[PDB]
């Protein structure tokens, strides 16, 4: 009839709802037991770290009712996965009623005379042979007349006290007994009975049926446990509804429990069904994808306390959504999507947080994404650049790294102060080493490579920030000249001729490698095309013309040199200069 | 990889590739051997058509690229040099064709933007005349030969986007390009290419390639019509080929469909492509690297080859006729032949005779009788009587008696003594020994045989034979069968009206000798055409290639000189090519008595060769020695008043070497963007200056600056 | 002999007249001495001071004479290429072609390639049509017979007299251009990938 109690009960949560009451800590825990239980994956260690949770809710309870029930249930259930009679005869003791047995049991144990409520005591006493200890010093003395009795007694005690396939030969043991008690008023049909209670028969237990778990626990497999029911619900002692969550959770459906709990208030439905998902087997689909929408949905307000360390937040809500079935990601989109269309903020934090979440896991394409559409936020109109350039760095995406890069020089060229002041917080790693050090820690294979892109631009602005005696302005010289040809190489890069052009009046106009490299440069840039040429052109007559802001002399020759009436000529400046160079410095003999 | 054109030059010696990855490589065939040299680059977009030049006006190239830009490359003293670039279209240059030598230096340009200009060459830089074109755009252009002989030293056709073709005439009138007449409605989609045919005749063959069809006009002097084959991919490019009148069509099918022409009407058939047919009859393709030689397939020509020049030798002695027994020889056809147009004459049914006397000899082998009927087959009836007289008993009284007027063997004898039965090569000769004799008649077997063929299978397949005694009844053209039987059977009997046509067959024969690596009977062949200047064109261009490929001695020019051939256009051929390969090279053309004012213009090449005083001695006295034909002669002897100057040394001037600083200045101002004319001509004033006072004579800035500063010190 | 004492006794330092000696100065044969001296010793010096440009005419002659020794430590021929900056860029670059081609007929990289850069640097540096270097059978038979056989077929006959007179009196150089070399560098390069 299990079954029909678990299609009633289908009937039953649909009816209910859904409602986080819970505190910050309660989730917090789940969530933490949970993760612990998933990033684990010998399985004994995690059911101990349940019953720890399991101990943390009783704690929240006392501290302190849906949680109170659910709670139960969780425990039942947990309790029954895990000695089975064994840990059922553990969770006697709580009972699920109007009352109790134990205190009465407790208050029961001393007497001057034996009590009129003391066999019904034995019955619902049968932790058990020391019940029965005391049932073998009851006294007796009661109006009466022995003729024995105790030899009896002490007999039934002490078959009693064997135990408490050796079960079989302790019922053998027990009926051979029977056959000698039976072989030789109230005293003799109570023992009869009581005995008939220990033996483990269906006409006693049933007998004793003040409550229906009471009789079902009376009585390693599942079978024996539907078997149990089967035979309990037959007989007219349980409620109809609570009590069909409990009927459930005995039962094989264990799904519909979980139905139950998630028309509980505690999310922990959700933590039981984790359980229910590496221990045991098998509106909107499953109830995989419900308790993915719920938890999201629920923790999408909720920021909750500080804890002792950072829980930005959406910490916990990834967390479990990566935590399915592999149609995980098809939800991650969504939700971190979700959160990307509420990206647009100034804030490093969320970004960072989320990508350490994303990092997780095995999707790298949408921190991808998301590092490359906070470049797109933090574009902006002319701030935070090495930030923001350093999240263009992040996740790949190199020739937009690039783009930046070079819109960032070219600034520099247009002005060659560009990035200074406190813009050099935008950067602020001063150090190549350090820094890099200190970056790819992380991510070694990305922010080492991406971080060696930064070398160029940072030596030229070192270059241009040192325009020790007369010796290290030629060394200046020799790694301005090194950095454009290296920007140079390039090309077989459209600001680059202007670069040269600058070096090129610094040069000289009336080392030695340096100039044979300036040469080969000038050389790969005659002979470019149509293509490489107009727009480095376009661009040098874009510099001269100073609008956002040593090189006054070079921007007074560049602008005598364009100078009309109504590119070439600098280069022409370049070998007749460079020839000069080579006709002094080159005869250099020792 | 992805090539858009392949260029041969006018040899066939060096390759020019085109690309897209805007790169222009120069490639150097020699068969196989393909060896790479230079590399070109400096275009926008891919460059879609290079096009060489004519020799005679040296190694030039011509570019069209995608950016709508049109490089003219040429090489420098060993060297290529980007000299004139060309910018004046909207869209891109799709194709750029060459003009011809004898119409001067022109380019011809098309590009998709809606005008297609024409760039002369000035005797120093460009000079460009603009034209209107198609509105949606053109795609192709082709120069149209004149009529005219010149090798040392005008109309071109436009294919268009507008689903239509022009044809531009030249224009003195206002210095511009006419419409004469304009062509509706070739195909219904965009024309992809159009081609002209260099091929000199009688009519003018345009080629249209878009609608995956191809239309083909033909341009007498009236309006061209056309045929278009549904070949149904699309067709984009079509190269012309001087080497039989054949026309390549290329599109998107991974091969190149061949056309040639036949006399029926009908052409029958032997992302981008590209091809061009070589004139040294070779067909390119774009795999990259293509060289497929296309010649047309028969019977090797060699013992043809043999006879031919038997003929030749047989027949040019002073300053023509094609004989029948004067050059019969060997060969059986010819004998055949000759006794073919007299009614069984000459002995016909005993030549046959003596065939089937040296055939059935294979047959009568192996044979036990049966041997009778074979022989019986053969002329002789003599062993067919005798093999019957064997057995058969009185069976040989009737085979006597054909020979005088329940078995297989007596129904074959009794259907030959009034089908064929069997099959052999003797089966016509059969046929005609015993259905003729009760009329002696030759015609009337011939047509019973050619009706009892037309009426069975598998009859006298691929024979000469057949040509040759189907011409007999009904004398005219059949199929292809040496081309002198045919024109001897153009003298007497016969085809009529096809004159043209022949002089098309003679020139398709004659570019198929060409094409098998042969000139000398080529040139023969190609000397008897119909026409004055179709033939000295021909002659002369072809004469260009050979002596391309030609020296002094008897063993090569005494055989091209006892063709007939004048000795004015072989030398200047030869020097044509030897143009772009020194200066010792003209020289052939000024003792080739064809130079006039190539000698007069080959000062330009002595220039350089002054790097060597008695030489320029003895070339200034040849110089000299011609005071012929502009004829700026006082000029010109400069360059033998020079060594004067140099051998001279100081004792007063020589009243005319003020005279040779005059010339010589005159020259220095005329020379034009010459660097090389102009440092030679600096240097030998340097070296004048040592000499005489040398007032004039200066040219660069440095070496007159310091060498005046340094003289008046 | 006694020339050794005078360009000993010479002992050139910031003078500004010995250069009066040697315009007034037989034979300047001892110059090409000094001037070995001053090579020998510091060097560039004497590009820092030039009496006139007729007088380093000869200088410069001599020291292209020392550059024909092919004396590798070449030496002279760079200082050679110095002077030639100042005045006649032409020379330097023909200087340092020849220059490319003792070395090419006798480490290979850093040599010509900056030789070549140089050769170009003094190409751009010289305007057009200046790019001028110097860069150190049977058939004339059918010249004379053919000559002879055209004479016969055709105060001039003054000039045809001395023409004949010098025809009595009877009985090496490169052309280096501009995409000459420009392209020889290019082939080089090309033969230098190919390795």
Same mark, same amino acid.
């Given at each position: 009839?299990?079954?029909?109690?678990?299609?009633?009960?289908?009937?039953?949560?649909?009816?209910?709802?859904?409602? +986080?009451?819970?505190?910050?800590?309660?989730?917090?825990?789940?969530?933490?037991?949970?993760?612990?239980?998933?990033?684990?994956?010998?399985?004994?260690?995690?059911?101990?770290?349940?019953?720890?949770?399991?101990?943390?809710?009783? &704690?929240?309870?006392?501290?302190?009712?849906?949680?109170?029930?659910?709670?139960?249930?969780?425990?039942?259930?947990?309790?029954?996965? $895990?000695?089975?009679?064994?840990?059922?005869? &553990?969770?006697?003791?709580?009972?699920?009623?109007?009352?109790?047995?134990?205190?009465?049991?407790?208050? /029961?144990? +001393?007497?001057?005379?034996? $009590?009129?409520?003391?066999?019904?005591?034995?019955?619902?006493?049968?932790?058990?042979?020391?019940?029965?200890?005391?049932?073998?010093?009851?006294?007796?003395?009661?109006?009466?007349?022995?003729?024995?009795?105790?030899?009896?007694?002490?007999?039934?005690?002490?078959?009693?006290?064997?135990?408490?396939?050796?079960?079989?030969?302790?019922?053998?043991?027990?009926?051979?007994?029977?056959? &000698?008690?039976?072989?030789?008023?109230?005293?003799?049909?109570?023992?009869?009975?009581?005995?008939?209670?220990?033996?483990?028969?269906?006409?006693?237990?049933?007998?004793?049926?003040?409550?229906?778990?009471?009789?079902?626990?009376?009585?390693?497999?599942?079978?024996?446990?539907?078997?149990?029911?089967?035979?309990?619900?037959?007989?007219?002692?349980?409620?109809?509804?609570?009590?069909?969550?409990?009927?459930?959770?005995?039962?094989?459906?264990?799904?519909?429990?979980?139905?139950?709990?998630?028309?509980?208030?505690?999310?922990?439905?959700?933590?039981?069904?984790?359980?229910?998902?590496?221990?045991?087997?098998?509106?909107?689909?499953?109830?995989?994808?419900?308790?993915?929408?719920?938890?999201?949905? %629920?923790?999408?307000?909720?920021?909750?306390?500080?804890?002792?360390?950072?829980?930005?937040?959406?910490?916990?809500?990834?967390?479990?959504?990566?935590?399915?079935?592999? &149609?995980?990601?098809?939800?991650?989109?969504?939700?971190?999507?979700?959160?990307?269309?509420?990206? /647009?903020?100034?804030?490093?934090?969320?970004?960072?947080?989320?990508?350490?979440?994303?990092?997780?896991?095995?999707?790298?394409?949408?921190?991808?994404?998301?590092?490359?559409?906070?470049?797109?936020?933090? %574009?902006?109109?002319?701030?935070?650049?090495?930030?923001?350039?350093?999240?263009?760095?992040?996740?790949?995406?190199?020739?937009?790294?690039?783009?930046?890069?070079?819109?960032?020089?070219?600034?520099?060229?247009?002005?060659?102060?560009?990035?200074?002041?406190?813009?050099?917080?935008?950067?602020?790693?001063?150090?190549?080493?350090?820094?890099?050090?200190?970056?790819?820690?992380?991510?070694?294979?990305?922010?080492?490579?991406?971080?060696?892109?930064?070398?160029?631009?940072?030596?030229?602005?070192?270059?241009?920030?040192?325009?020790?005696?007369?010796?290290?302005?030629?060394?200046?010289?020799?790694?301005?000249?090194?950095?454009?040809?290296?920007?140079?190489?390039?090309?077989?890069?459209?600001?680059?001729?202007?670069?040269?052009?600058?070096?090129?009046?610094?040069?000289?106009?009336?080392?030695?490698?340096?100039?044979?490299?300036?040469?080969?440069?000038?050389?790969?840039?005659?002979?470019?095309?149509?293509?490489?040429?107009?727009?480095?052109?376009?661009?040098?007559?874009?510099?001269?013309?100073?609008?956002?802001?040593?090189?006054?002399?070079?921007?007074?020759?560049?602008?005598?040199?364009?100078?009309?009436?109504?590119?070439?000529?600098?280069?022409?400046?370049?070998?007749?200069?460079?020839?000069?160079?080579?006709?002094?410095?080159?005869?250099?003999?020792? | 990889?992805?090539?858009?054109?392949?260029?041969?030059?006018?040899?066939?010696?060096?390759?020019?590739?085109? !690309?897209?990855?805007?790169?222009?490589?120069?490639?150097?065939?020699?068969?196989?051997?393909?060896?790479?040299?230079?590399?070109?680059?400096?275009?926008?977009?891919?460059?879609?058509?290079?096009?060489?030049?004519?020799?005679?006006?040296?190694?030039?190239?011509?570019?069209?690229?995608?950016?709508?830009?049109?490089?003219?490359?040429?090489?420098?003293?060993?060297?290529?040099?980007?000299?004139?670039?060309?910018?004046?279209?909207?869209?891109?240059?799709?194709?750029?064709?060459?003009?011809?030598?004898?119409?001067?230096?022109?380019?011809?340009?098309? !590009?998709?933007?809606?005008?297609?200009?024409?760039?002369?060459?000035?005797?120093?830089?460009?000079?460009?005349?603009?034209?209107?074109?198609?509105?949606?755009?053109?795609?192709?252009?082709?120069?149209?030969?004149?009529?005219?002989?010149?090798?040392?030293?005008?109309?071109?056709?436009?294919?268009?986007?507008?689903?239509?073709?022009?044809?531009?005439?030249?224009?003195?009138?206002?210095?511009?390009?006419?419409?004469?007449?304009?062509?509706?409605?070739?195909?219904?989609?965009?024309?992809?290419?159009?081609?002209?045919?260099?091929?000199?005749?009688?009519?003018?063959?345009?080629?249209?390639?878009?609608?995956?069809?191809?239309?083909?006009?033909?341009?007498?002097?009236?309006?061209?019509?056309?045929?278009?084959?549904?070949?149904?991919?699309?067709?984009?490019?079509?190269?012309?080929?001087?080497?039989?009148?054949?026309?390549?069509?290329?599109?998107?099918?991974?091969?190149?469909?061949?056309?040639?022409?036949?006399? @029926?009407?009908?052409?029958?058939?032997?992302?981008?492509?590209?091809?061009?047919?070589?004139?040294?009859?070779?067909?390119?393709?774009?795999?990259?690297?293509?060289?497929?030689?296309?010649?047309?397939?028969?019977?090797?020509?060699?013992?043809?080859?043999?006879?031919?020049?038997?003929?030749?030798?047989?027949?040019?002695?002073?300053?023509?006729?094609?004989?029948?027994?004067?050059?019969?020889?060997?060969?059986?056809?010819?004998?055949?032949?000759?006794?073919?147009?007299?009614?069984?004459?000459?002995?016909?049914?005993?030549?046959?005779?003596?065939?089937?006397?040296?055939?059935?000899?294979?047959?009568?082998?192996?044979?036990?009788?049966? @041997?009778?009927?074979?022989?019986?087959?053969?002329?002789?009836?003599?062993?067919?009587?005798?093999?019957?007289?064997?057995?058969?008993?009185?069976?040989?009284?009737?085979?006597?008696?054909?020979?005088?007027?329940?078995?297989?063997?007596?129904?074959?004898?009794?259907?030959?003594?009034?089908?064929?039965?069997?099959?052999?090569?003797?089966?016509?000769?059969?046929?005609?020994?015993?259905?003729?004799?009760?009329?002696?008649?030759?015609?009337?077997?011939?047509?019973?045989?050619?009706?009892?063929?037309?009426?069975?299978?598998?009859?006298?397949?691929?024979?000469?034979?057949?040509?040759?005694?189907?011409?007999?009844?009904?004398?005219?053209?059949?199929?292809?069968?040496?081309?002198?039987?045919?024109?001897?059977?153009?003298?007497?009997?016969?085809?009529?009206?096809?004159?043209?046509?022949?002089?098309?067959?003679?020139?398709?024969?004659?570019?198929?000798?060409?094409?098998? !690596?042969?000139?000398?009977?080529?040139?023969?062949?190609?000397?008897?055409?119909?026409?004055?200047?179709?033939?000295?064109?021909?002659?002369?261009?072809?004469?260009?290639?050979?002596?391309?490929?030609?020296?002094?001695?008897?063993?090569?020019?005494?055989?091209?000189? @006892?063709?007939?051939?004048?000795?004015?256009?072989?030398?200047?051929?030869?020097?044509?090519?030897?143009?772009?390969?020194?200066?010792?090279?003209?020289?052939?053309?000024?003792?080739?008595?064809?130079?006039?004012?190539?000698?007069?213009?080959?000062?330009?090449?002595?220039?350089?060769?002054?790097?060597?005083?008695?030489?320029?001695?003895?070339?200034?006295?040849?110089?000299?020695?011609?005071?012929?034909?502009?004829?700026?002669?006082?000029?010109?002897?400069?360059?033998?008043?020079?060594?004067?100057?140099?051998?001279?040394?100081?004792?007063?001037?020589?009243?005319?070497?003020?005279?040779?600083?005059?010339?010589?200045?005159?020259?220095?101002?005329?020379?034009?963007?010459?660097?090389?004319?102009?440092?030679?001509?600096?240097?030998?004033?340097?070296?004048?200056?040592?000499?005489?006072?040398?007032?004039?004579?200066?040219?660069?800035?440095?070496?007159?600056?310091?060498?005046?500063?340094?003289?008046?010190? | 002999?006694?020339?050794?004492?005078?360009?000993?006794?010479?002992?050139?330092?910031?003078?500004?007249?010995?250069?009066?000696?040697?315009?007034?100065?037989?034979?300047?044969?001892?110059?090409?001495?000094?001037?070995?001296?001053?090579?020998?010793?510091?060097?560039?010096?004497?590009?820092?001071?030039?009496?006139?440009?007729?007088?380093?005419?000869?200088?410069?002659?001599?020291?292209?004479?020392? =550059?024909?020794?092919?004396?590798?430590?070449?030496?002279?021929?760079?200082?050679?290429?110095?002077?030639?900056?100042?005045?006649?860029?032409?020379?330097?670059?023909?200087?340092?072609?020849?220059?490319?081609?003792?070395?090419?007929?006798?480490?290979?990289?850093?040599?010509?390639?900056?030789?070549?850069?140089?050769?170009?640097?003094?190409?751009? =540096?010289?305007?057009?049509?200046?790019?001028?270097?110097?860069?150190?059978?049977?058939?004339?038979?059918?010249?004379?017979?053919?000559?002879?056989?055209?004479?016969?077929?055709?105060?001039?006959?003054?000039?045809?007299?001395?023409?004949?007179?010098?025809?009595?009196?009877?009985?090496?150089?490169?052309?280096?251009?501009?995409?000459?070399?420009?392209?020889?560098?290019?082939?080089?390069?090309?033969?230098?990938?190919?390795?």
């Amino acid at each position: 009839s299990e079954y029909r109690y678990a299609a009633l009960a289908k009937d039953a949560y649909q009816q209910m709802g859904t409602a +986080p009451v819970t505190e910050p800590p309660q989730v917090i825990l789940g969530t933490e037991d949970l993760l612990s239980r998933l990033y684990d994956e010998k399985m004994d260690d995690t059911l101990a770290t349940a019953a720890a949770q399991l101990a943390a809710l009783w &704690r929240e309870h006392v501290d302190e009712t849906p949680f109170e029930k659910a709670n139960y249930l969780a425990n039942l259930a947990l309790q029954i996965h $895990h000695p089975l009679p064994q840990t059922l005869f &553990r969770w006697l003791n709580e009972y699920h009623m109007y009352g109790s047995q134990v205190d009465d049991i407790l208050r /029961h144990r +001393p007497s001057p005379a034996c $009590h009129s409520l003391f066999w019904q005591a034995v019955f619902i006493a049968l932790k058990v042979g020391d019940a029965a200890r005391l049932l073998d010093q009851a006294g007796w003395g009661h109006v009466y007349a022995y003729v024995n009795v105790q030899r009896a007694v002490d007999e039934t005690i002490a078959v009693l006290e064997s135990c408490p396939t050796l079960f079989r030969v302790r019922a053998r043991g027990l009926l051979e007994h029977l056959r &000698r008690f039976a072989e030789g008023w109230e005293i003799y049909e109570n023992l009869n009975i009581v005995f008939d209670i220990v033996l483990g028969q269906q006409g006693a237990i049933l007998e004793a049926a003040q409550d229906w778990l009471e009789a079902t626990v009376g009585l390693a497999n599942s079978e024996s446990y539907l078997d149990r029911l089967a035979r309990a619900f037959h007989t007219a002692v349980e409620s109809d509804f609570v009590e069909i969550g409990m009927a459930c959770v005995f039962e094989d459906n264990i799904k519909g429990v979980i139905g139950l709990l998630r028309g509980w208030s505690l999310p922990i439905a959700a933590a039981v069904a984790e359980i229910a998902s590496l221990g045991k087997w098998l509106e909107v689909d499953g109830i995989k994808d419900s308790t993915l929408v719920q938890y999201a949905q %629920a923790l999408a307000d909720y920021e909750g306390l500080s804890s002792v360390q950072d829980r930005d937040g959406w910490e916990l809500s990834i967390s479990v959504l990566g935590r399915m079935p592999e &149609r995980s990601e098809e939800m991650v989109r969504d939700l971190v999507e979700h959160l990307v269309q509420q990206l /647009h903020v100034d804030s490093n934090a969320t970004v960072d947080r989320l990508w350490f979440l994303l990092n997780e896991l095995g999707m790298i394409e949408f921190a991808e994404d998301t590092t490359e559409t906070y470049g797109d936020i933090l %574009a902006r109109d002319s701030h935070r650049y090495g930030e923001a350039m350093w999240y263009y760095a992040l996740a790949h995406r190199p020739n937009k790294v690039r783009e930046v890069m070079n819109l960032l020089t070219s600034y520099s060229l247009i002005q060659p102060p560009a990035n200074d002041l406190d813009d050099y917080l935008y950067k602020l790693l001063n150090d190549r080493k350090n820094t890099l050090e200190q970056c790819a820690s992380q991510d070694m294979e990305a922010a080492e490579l991406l971080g060696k892109m930064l070398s160029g631009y940072a030596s030229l602005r070192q270059f241009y920030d040192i325009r020790p005696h007369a010796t290290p302005l030629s060394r200046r010289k020799q790694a301005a000249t090194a950095l454009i040809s290296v920007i140079a190489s390039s090309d077989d890069e459209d600001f680059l001729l202007a670069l040269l052009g600058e070096a090129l009046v610094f040069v000289s106009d009336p080392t030695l490698d340096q100039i044979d490299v300036l040469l080969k440069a000038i050389e790969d840039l005659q002979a470019v095309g149509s293509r490489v040429y107009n727009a480095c052109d376009e661009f040098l007559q874009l510099v001269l013309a100073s609008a956002p802001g040593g090189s006054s002399l070079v921007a007074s020759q560049l602008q005598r040199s364009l100078s009309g009436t109504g590119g070439e000529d600098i280069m022409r400046r370049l070998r007749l200069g460079l020839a000069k160079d080579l006709a002094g410095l080159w005869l250099a003999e020792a | 990889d992805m090539i858009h054109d392949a260029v041969l030059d006018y040899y066939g010696r060096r390759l020019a590739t085109c !690309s897209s990855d805007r790169t222009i490589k120069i490639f150097e065939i020699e068969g196989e051997t393909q060896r790479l040299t230079e590399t070109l680059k400096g275009h926008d977009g891919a460059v879609w058509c290079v096009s060489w030049a004519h020799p005679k006006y040296g190694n030039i190239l011509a570019s069209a690229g995608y950016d709508g830009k049109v490089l003219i490359w040429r090489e420098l003293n060993g060297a290529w040099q980007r000299i004139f670039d060309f910018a004046l279209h909207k869209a891109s240059v799709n194709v750029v064709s060459w003009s011809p030598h004898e119409a001067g230096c022109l380019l011809a340009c098309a !590009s998709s933007d809606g005008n297609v200009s024409v760039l002369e060459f000035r005797d120093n830089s460009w000079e460009h005349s603009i034209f209107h074109a198609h509105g949606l755009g053109v795609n192709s252009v082709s120069w149209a030969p004149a009529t005219s002989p010149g090798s040392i030293v005008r109309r071109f056709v436009t294919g268009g986007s507008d689903n239509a073709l022009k044809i531009w005439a030249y224009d003195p009138a206002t210095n511009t390009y006419k419409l004469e007449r304009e062509p509706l409605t070739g195909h219904t989609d965009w024309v992809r290419d159009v081609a002209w045919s260099p091929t000199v005749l009688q009519k003018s063959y345009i080629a249209s390639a878009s609608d995956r069809t191809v239309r083909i006009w033909t341009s007498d002097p009236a309006n061209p019509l056309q045929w278009n084959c549904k070949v149904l991919a699309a067709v984009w490019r079509v190269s012309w080929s001087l080497s039989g009148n054949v026309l390549a069509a290329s599109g998107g099918d991974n091969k190149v469909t061949l056309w040639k022409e036949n006399l @029926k009407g009908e052409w029958e058939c032997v992302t981008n492509w590209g091809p061009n047919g070589l004139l040294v009859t070779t067909h390119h393709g774009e795999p990259a690297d293509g060289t497929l030689a296309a010649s047309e397939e028969s019977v090797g020509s060699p013992e043809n080859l043999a006879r031919l020049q038997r003929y030749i030798d047989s027949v040019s002695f002073k300053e023509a006729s094609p004989e029948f027994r004067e050059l019969a020889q060997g060969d059986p056809s010819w004998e055949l032949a000759s006794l073919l147009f007299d009614d069984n004459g000459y002995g016909l049914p005993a030549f046959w005779r003596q065939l089937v006397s040296e055939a059935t000899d294979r047959a009568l082998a192996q044979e036990p009788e049966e @041997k009778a009927i074979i022989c019986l087959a053969g002329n002789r009836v003599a062993d067919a009587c005798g093999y019957l007289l064997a057995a058969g008993n009185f069976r040989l009284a009737t085979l006597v008696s054909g020979i005088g007027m329940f078995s297989q063997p007596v129904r074959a004898i009794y259907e030959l003594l009034a089908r064929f039965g069997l099959d052999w090569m003797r089966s016509f000769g059969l046929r005609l020994f015993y259905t003729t004799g009760a009329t002696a008649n030759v015609a009337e077997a011939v047509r019973s045989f050619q009706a009892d063929i037309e009426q069975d299978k598998e009859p006298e397949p691929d024979s000469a034979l057949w040509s040759l005694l189907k011409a007999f009844a009904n004398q005219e053209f059949d199929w292809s069968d040496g081309w002198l039987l045919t024109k001897a059977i153009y003298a007497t009997g016969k085809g009529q009206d096809a004159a043209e046509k022949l002089d098309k067959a003679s020139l398709a024969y004659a570019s198929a000798l060409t094409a098998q !690596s042969q000139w000398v009977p080529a040139t023969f062949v190609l000397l008897q055409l119909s026409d004055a200047a179709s033939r000295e064109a021909a002659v002369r261009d072809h004469l260009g290639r050979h002596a391309r490929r030609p020296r002094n001695p008897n063993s090569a020019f005494s055989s091209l000189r @006892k063709f007939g051939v004048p000795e004015t256009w072989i030398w200047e051929a030869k020097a044509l090519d030897f143009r772009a390969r020194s200066q010792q090279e003209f020289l052939a053309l000024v003792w080739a008595q064809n130079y006039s004012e190539a000698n007069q213009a080959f000062v330009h090449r002595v220039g350089p060769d002054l790097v060597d005083f008695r030489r320029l001695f003895r070339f200034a006295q040849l110089l000299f020695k011609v005071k012929g034909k502009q004829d700026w002669d006082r000029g010109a002897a400069v360059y033998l008043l020079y060594p004067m100057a140099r051998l001279q040394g100081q004792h007063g001037l020589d009243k005319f070497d003020h005279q040779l600083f005059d010339g010589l200045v005159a020259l220095r101002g005329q020379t034009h963007g010459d660097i090389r004319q102009e440092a030679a001509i600096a240097d030998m004033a340097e070296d004048l200056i040592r000499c005489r006072g040398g007032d004039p004579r200066l040219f660069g800035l440095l070496p007159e600056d310091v060498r005046s500063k340094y003289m008046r010190a | 002999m006694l020339s050794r004492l005078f360009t000993a006794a010479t002992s050139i330092s910031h003078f500004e007249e010995a250069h009066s000696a040697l315009l007034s100065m037989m034979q300047k044969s001892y110059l090409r001495r000094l001037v070995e001296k001053m090579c020998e010793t510091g060097q560039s010096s004497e590009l820092i001071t030039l009496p006139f440009s007729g007088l380093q005419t000869k200088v410069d002659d001599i020291l292209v004479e020392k =550059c024909r020794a092919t004396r590798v430590p070449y030496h002279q021929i760079l200082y050679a290429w110095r002077i030639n900056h100042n005045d006649y860029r032409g020379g330097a670059a023909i200087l340092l072609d020849r220059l490319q081609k003792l070395r090419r007929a006798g480490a290979l990289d850093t040599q010509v390639t900056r030789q070549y850069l140089l050769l170009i640097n003094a190409l751009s =540096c010289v305007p057009p049509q200046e790019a001028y270097i110097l860069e150190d059978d049977d058939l004339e038979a059918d010249i004379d017979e053919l000559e002879k056989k055209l004479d016969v077929e055709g105060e001039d006959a003054a000039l045809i007299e001395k023409m004949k007179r010098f025809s009595t009196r009877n009985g090496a150089r490169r052309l280096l251009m501009l995409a000459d070399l420009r392209k020889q560098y290019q082939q080089e390069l090309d033969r230098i990938v190919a390795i």
